[PDB]
Design a protein around this ligand. Structure first.
Ligand SMILES: Cc1cc2nc3c(=O)[nH]c(=O)nc-3n(C[C@H](O)[C@H](O)[C@H](O)COP(=O)(O)O)c2cc1C
Ligand code: SF4
Ligand code: SF4
Ligand code: SF4
Ligand code: SF4
Ligand code: FES
Ligand code: FES
Ligand SMILES: [Zn+2]
Lengths: 210, 80, 106, 263, 24, 83, 426, 87, 13
């Protein structure tokens, strides 16, 4: 965790919120309680990430500036969270869930397939600078275990060739039907809806007295 | 941060010449009572030792850390 | 072996010497490493206890096999770093064999 | 009034409401082994080397933190509060680099002592150790920070006693390193105090790097003449030349701190 | 298998202001 | 002169002791010997340094050869390690 | 005995099937008695939960009513607050992902129903940043509700004022912790605080605050509507109410069903969800509450049922009630090993026992999977485990120790053999 | 841990009272150390009397004097602590 | 959309 100034990643890279971005900023502060600019740094840091994935040292200094906080304060927030990237991020940035639930349901299986398809090691960007694979931890959505979040694509329940299919979709064209490519809906017993197969009771159903 | 060496009073004789030795450069001292530091449990007893032995004394009052109020909740106060 | 003297001036060989024989003063060598500017064992003060051999973490100071170092003048018996380092170079082969034989025991 | 009655292994002292469990032990005279707690620095609870056992309580409490309540007898030398120290010291030492004959806070270590008095005779960490990367914090403080026990007293002092607010924690897990994210020197007066306040010898003084070792230093208590605050100081002399000047506490004038100039 | 002279190796410890050689 | 450079000036008294005698100085001056030591290349981010021989070396330390910018130097052997 | 009726089931919109949006919510009739409830009084709302005896729906189990009762004390001039943590970093907790995504409204009225119970000025919902799409769904829902005037000043045509906000998480499991959610909300690093200054006393921005699992906030409006008793009956003794159960891994149809609590463990895989993949005898072990809770082996599996009292008797925790199942086809030594890898990549490092201890167990666990480590080391990991369990500032160190303790407790012979296997091939 | 034999701790304690009763004068603070060792403490005037009783008493014959020493506690008003060890 | 959650925030504001 040390930013050794590099021509690419260093403040020479000027950063400033787009007129549109700055707007987004003000909104954030107000959402937070009055006189508390500091709470807004994680959201403001997120929009710097939205602006640019790299988010270099220059970008964090601006965040601290806009939020008038000790610069270190922003540096500490960026380092602690994995969501922020302090290094350039691939356009797609796929992340594969490899906690025990997904592994038990084959998460590892998927990995090998994706490494071959992207033809690259796990953890770095494709030469095409189009893809970036990382072994991220539990991303939620375990019921659907095989899983790979690509910039919130959160594709889930994915068989190996599925991903290959998805990756191809990403490689040529866009928006490859993000979601559980499996037939099931959201999370649902693959069998059906044992929980509630009847119609839902309407408003004020069996509302207790009092 | 240990305070077990700030408990007993000590009386120490005044420091004297420590000239360098020409042959080996070791420190050399002509004062016999230099390395002697006697330890006394209470200020009254140490003063007594100086009076009967005839050495001059200049007692320094013990200064103990003042009580300081601390509470983990207090710094969490955004107000201050 | 490389040739860098083992002592790193932790100075506990000075601390445990019973006779106050070893005098060590140190300063960071330009390399940035830690070395002793002056290491003086006063052999007339030393009572050859062998604790220094014991205490050294890098085992830089060792009790060498030679017992025949009788000297015409008292000053020769006082030893600075250069005599001891020279003593170390002369007897290193046997010192290494001796430490080799007894280290499992220690 | 405002004198709760709390028991220290029975001495039954009476203390102001709001005094920490560690503070209650102090007035009886007992010392809770502590790291990351400094009297004039905010309580942080990072080390938890101070876990004690209030009587009739399921878990041990953080001394520096729990405000002592009414009639809770502290058991500072119980069979539990010693396994709560014999097992913490196991951890601090596990990732520690054993270069105690490099660490010039050799005899000035609050971590060997507490290990050597309250910790364990042997180690069980058969696994490997970690290493951090030494950086430059300036020309006065040598930060061999692979020594750091992540006790966050620096980050406090550098924010609370001095208003530098530069030093900070970076990252999570066992590679949380408490060093400036970008290499900006810690330039401020009051800077050298970090040395005195880091109980570990991670960052120590660069001029007094390896000139001495504390048992030898003869310590004479004198007065600061560089500035007119007249801060109390202790001049540590070995064989007749001054080796270091470090602060000695005067409640009114310099309360444990001295300027970068006068040390 | 098939006269020393002792001296202090440490240098000076207190240096001395050398008079200005410029007369005034 | 010697490892430290202890030397006696012309005006310096305390240099007579060598008159008609010899001084103890060292060839194989260590200051340059490790500098003469090749940089131990390694694969791992961190590496150990028993000093060579375990019990017959130095209290083991793990050095972070993490930045090619700097070859870690075990504070005990002065051996530079080239990532 | 489970088998809750669909009508009784809380989130009818579970599995979608009904517009998660307001018009679907109106057919759900989620906003039916909201004005009345708030009108009744804050004291009436807490009477309802005290009668319900609901336990925390998050990993920790505590009476929900007593927790809310704590900051019902008179305001000291600081605005009281509500914090809803939609973060669920724990493996198998895809549960809360449902209410948020499928039925956002239920949680919106849960927030104001809960808000007047604690007299909170406003509620902040910390949905994990990972779920960006999920966030898109709730503020669309929150926006609908205010447009309606259901929330905002004079919310639901009543004297009371409430504002609901959504906060972005940033991929941290620890952010989930009650004192650490706050600090992330405060904008400092997500590092838990000590409990002495309790969350109500010094909450967020030094203003009294309370934290609830999203499930806990969501059920409060329906429990007030159905009354504590209705809800109280389903549960068992202290245990009570239906809690969503997620079954993931080695089961024929992994799914989250809100079937009743106190369900025989053998029954929920066998009757709902999908029977254990490979047969109920192909069950090397069950993780009842998620990664933090100790796994229970099949022997005790069916005997015990899913309720917090029964599980604590069993030495395991109901927790998030995430059932992770491991067939006889899995290297548990490696399964639990990745959960310790799950915790070394995630603990904040603020406290000494978790920082080095969790890393220490990770190193030993990796050697255990290889079998390189000797048999005597096993017990030491145990001793390392309890050093971490009682000494940590937060509960995650509590959580890291339990899976290690479970592996040694029931699968000690298998680890010894892996010990033996490597020693034989030399 | 040293092999303490409580059998001793008791017998020597019992003698310590015996002596304390026999010579109520000149004898104070009689205590048996945790080292199975008794250390009657006597007023300086009881030097002659307490020793003689121990040298010539059938139930306590202490014929030889192992040592006579004087620790010096400078703090203590009475600086020296003459200690007589008898067998 | 990358900014859809954030744009949804302004309207709430
Ligand atoms: C490491 C850690 C992570 C946690 N993560 C969550 C979480 O993601 N969601 C949650 O509701 N509770 C989580 N908790 C439990 C909280 O500390 C707290 O007890 C709970 O959120 C309170 O909600 P409840 O009282 O409504 O159950 C976590 C606890 C720990 C120690
Ligand atoms: S000799 Fe051994 S012990 Fe004495 S200083 Fe040099 S190294 Fe440390
Ligand atoms: S700090 Fe320096 S001295 Fe104290 S233990 Fe670690 S290394 Fe040895
Ligand atoms: S540097 Fe010294 S003070 Fe700052 S954290 Fe590491 S140890 Fe604690
Ligand atoms: S246990 Fe200590 S380290 Fe692990 S998370 Fe809670 S606080 Fe941070
Ligand atoms: S572990 Fe992969 S989403 Fe829960
Ligand atoms: S000393 Fe107890 S918290 Fe650091
Ligand atoms: Zn080395």
């Amino acid at each position: 965790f040390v930013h050794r100034d590099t021509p690419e990643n260093n403040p020479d890279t000027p950063f400033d919120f787009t007129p549109e971005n700055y707007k987004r900023i003000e909104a954030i502060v107000k959402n937070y309680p009055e006189g508390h600019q500091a709470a807004a740094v994680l959201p403001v840091l997120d929009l710097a990430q939205r602006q640019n994935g790299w988010l270099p040292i220059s970008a964090m200094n601006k965040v601290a500036e806009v939020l008038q906080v000790p610069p270190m304060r922003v540096y500490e927030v960026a380092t602690f969270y994995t969501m922020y990237n302090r290094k350039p991020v691939g356009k797609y940035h796929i992340q594969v869930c490899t906690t025990t639930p997904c592994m038990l349901r084959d998460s590892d299986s998927i990995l090998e397939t994706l490494q071959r398809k992207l033809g690259i090691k796990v953890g770095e960007t494709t030469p095409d600078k189009l893809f970036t694979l990382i072994e991220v931890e539990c991303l939620g959505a375990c019921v659907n275990a095989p899983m790979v979040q690509i910039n919130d694509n959160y594709y889930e329940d994915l068989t190996p060739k599925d991903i290959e299919e998805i990756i191809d979709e990403l490689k040529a064209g866009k928006v490859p039907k993000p979601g559980p490519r499996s037939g099931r809906f959201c999370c649902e017993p693959a069998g059906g809806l044992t929980s509630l197969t009847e119609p839902p009771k309407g408003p004020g159903f069996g509302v207790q007295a009092g | 941060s240990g305070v077990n060496n700030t408990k007993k009073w000590k009386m120490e004789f005044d420091t004297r010449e420590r000239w360098e030795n020409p042959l080996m450069g070791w420190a050399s001292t002509a004062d016999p009572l230099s390395n002697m530091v006697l330890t006394f449990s209470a200020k009254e007893d140490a003063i007594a030792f100086a009076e009967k032995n005839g050495w001059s004394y200049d007692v320094e009052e013990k200064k103990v850390p003042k009580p300081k109020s601390k509470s983990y909740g207090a710094n969490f106060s955004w107000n201050k | 072996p490389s040739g860098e003297e083992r002592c790193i001036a932790c100075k506990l060989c000075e601390a445990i010497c019973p006779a106050q024989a070893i005098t060590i003063e140190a300063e960071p060598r330009a390399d940035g490493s830690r070395r002793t500017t002056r290491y003086d064992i006063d052999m007339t003060k030393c009572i050859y206890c062998g604790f220094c051999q014991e205490a050294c973490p890098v085992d830089a100071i060792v009790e060498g096999p030679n017992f025949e170092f009788s000297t015409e003048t008292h000053e020769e018996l006082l030893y600075n770093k250069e005599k001891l380092l020279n003593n170390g170079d002369k007897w290193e082969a046997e010192i290494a064999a001796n430490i080799q034989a007894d280290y499992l025991y220690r | 009034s405002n004198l709760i009655e709390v028991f220290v292994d029975g001495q039954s002292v009476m203390v102001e409401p709001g005094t920490t469990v560690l503070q209650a032990c102090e007035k009886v005279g007992m010392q809770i082994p502590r790291f990351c707690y400094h009297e004039r620095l905010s309580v942080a609870g990072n080390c938890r080397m101070c876990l004690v056992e209030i009587e009739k309580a399921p878990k041990v409490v953080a001394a520096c933190a729990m405000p002592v309540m009414k009639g809770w007898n502290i058991l500072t030398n119980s069979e539990k509060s010693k396994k709560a120290r014999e097992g913490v010291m196991e951890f601090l030492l596990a990732n520690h680099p054993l270069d105690c004959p490099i660490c010039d806070q050799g005899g000035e270590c609050d971590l060997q002592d507490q290990s050597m008095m309250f910790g364990s005779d042997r180690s069980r960490f058969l696994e490997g150790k970690r290493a951090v990367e030494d950086k430059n914090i300036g020309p006065l403080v040598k930060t061999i920070m692979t020594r750091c026990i992540q006790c966050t007293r620096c980050i406090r002092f550098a924010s609370e006693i001095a208003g530098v607010d530069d030093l900070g924690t970076t990252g999570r897990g066992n590679d949380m390193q408490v060093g400036t994210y970008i290499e900006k020197m810690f330039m401020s007066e009051l800077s050298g105090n970090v040395i005195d306040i880091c109980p570990v010898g991670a960052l120590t003084s660069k001029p007094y790097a390896f000139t001495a070792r504390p048992w030898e230093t003869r310590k004479t208590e004198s007065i600061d003449v560089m500035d007119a605050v007249g801060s109390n100081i202790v001049v540590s002399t070995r064989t007749g030349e001054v080796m270091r000047i470090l602060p000695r506490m005067h409640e009114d004038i310099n309360e444990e701190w001295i300027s970068d100039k006068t040390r | 298998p098939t006269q020393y002279v002792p001296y202090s190796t440490t240098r000076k410890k207190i240096h001395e202001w050398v008079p200005p050689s410029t007369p005034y | 002169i010697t490892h430290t450079g202890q030397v006696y000036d012309e005006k310096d008294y305390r240099r007579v002791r060598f008159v008609d005698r010899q001084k103890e100085v060292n060839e194989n001056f260590a200051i340059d010997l490790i500098a003469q030591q090749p940089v131990n290349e390694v694969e791992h981010r961190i590496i150990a340094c028993d000093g060579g021989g375990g019990a017959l070396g130095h209290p083991k330390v793990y050095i972070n050869l993490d930045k090619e910018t700097k070859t870690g130097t075990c504070g005990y052997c002065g051996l530079q390690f080239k990532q | 005995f489970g088998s809750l009726k669909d009508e009784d089931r809380i989130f009818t919109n579970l599995y979608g099937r009904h517009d998660w949006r307001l018009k679907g919510a109106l057919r759900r009739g989620d906003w039916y008695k909201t004005k009345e409830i708030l009108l009744k009084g804050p004291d009436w709302i807490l009477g309802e939960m005290k009668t319900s005896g609901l336990r925390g729906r998050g990993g920790a189990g505590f009476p929900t009513g007593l927790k809310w009762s704590f900051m019902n004390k008179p305001s000291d001039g600081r605005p009281k607050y509500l914090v809803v943590n939609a973060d669920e970093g724990e493996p198998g907790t895809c549960k809360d992902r449902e209410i948020m995504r499928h039925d956002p409204h239920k949680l919106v009225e849960g927030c104001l129903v809960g808000g007047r119970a604690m007299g909170a000025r406003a509620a902040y919902i910390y949905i994990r940043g990972e779920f960006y799409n999920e966030a898109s769904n709730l503020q669309v829902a929150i926006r609908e509700a205010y447009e309606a005037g259901l929330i905002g000043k004079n919310a639901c045509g009543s004297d009371y004022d409430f504002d609901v906000f959504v906060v972005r998480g940033a991929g941290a499991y620890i952010c989930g912790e009650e004192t650490a959610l706050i600090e992330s909300i405060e904008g400092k690093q997500g590092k838990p605080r000590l409990k002495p200054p309790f969350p109500a006393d010094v909450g967020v921005f030094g203003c009294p605050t309370t934290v609830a699992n999203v499930e806990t906030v969501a059920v409060s409006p329906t429990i007030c509507r159905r009354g504590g008793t209705w809800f109280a009956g389903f549960g068992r003794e202290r245990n009570s109410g239906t809690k969503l159960f997620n079954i993931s891994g080695h089961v024929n149809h992994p799914c989250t069903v809100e079937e009743e609590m106190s369900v025989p463990l053998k029954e929920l895989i066998e009757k709902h969800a999908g029977g254990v993949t490979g047969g109920w005898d192909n069950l090397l072990a069950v993780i009842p509450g998620g990664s933090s809770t100790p796994l229970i082996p099949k022997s005790v599996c069916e005997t015990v049922l899913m309720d917090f009292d029964a599980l604590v008797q069993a030495q395991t925790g109901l927790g998030t009630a995430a059932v992770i199942v491991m067939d006889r086809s899995t290297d548990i030594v490696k399964a639990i090993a990745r959960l310790i890898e799950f915790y070394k990549h995630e603990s904040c490092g603020q406290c000494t026992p978790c920082r080095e201890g969790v890393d220490w167990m990770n190193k030993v666990m990796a050697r255990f999977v290889k079998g390189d480590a000797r048999p005597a080391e096993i017990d030491s990991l145990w001793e390392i485990s309890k050093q971490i369990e009682g000494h940590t500032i937060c509960a995650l160190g509590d959580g890291a120790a339990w899976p290690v303790q479970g592996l040694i407790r029931h699968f000690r012979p298998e680890l010894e053999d892996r010990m033996q296997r490597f020693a034989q091939q030399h | 841990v040293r092999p303490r034999s409580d059998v001793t701790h008791k017998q020597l304690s019992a003698f310590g009272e015996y002596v304390a009763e026999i010579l109520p004068k000149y004898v104070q603070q009689v205590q048996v150390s945790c080292l199975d060792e008794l250390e009657i403490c006597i007023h300086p005037d009881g030097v002659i009397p307490t020793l003689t009783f121990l040298r010539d008493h059938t139930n306590a014959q202490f014929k030889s004097l192992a040592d006579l020493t004087a620790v010096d506690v400078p703090t203590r008003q009475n600086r020296f602590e003459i200690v007589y060890n008898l067998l | 959309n990358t900014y859809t959650f954030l744009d949804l925030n302004l309207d709430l504001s």
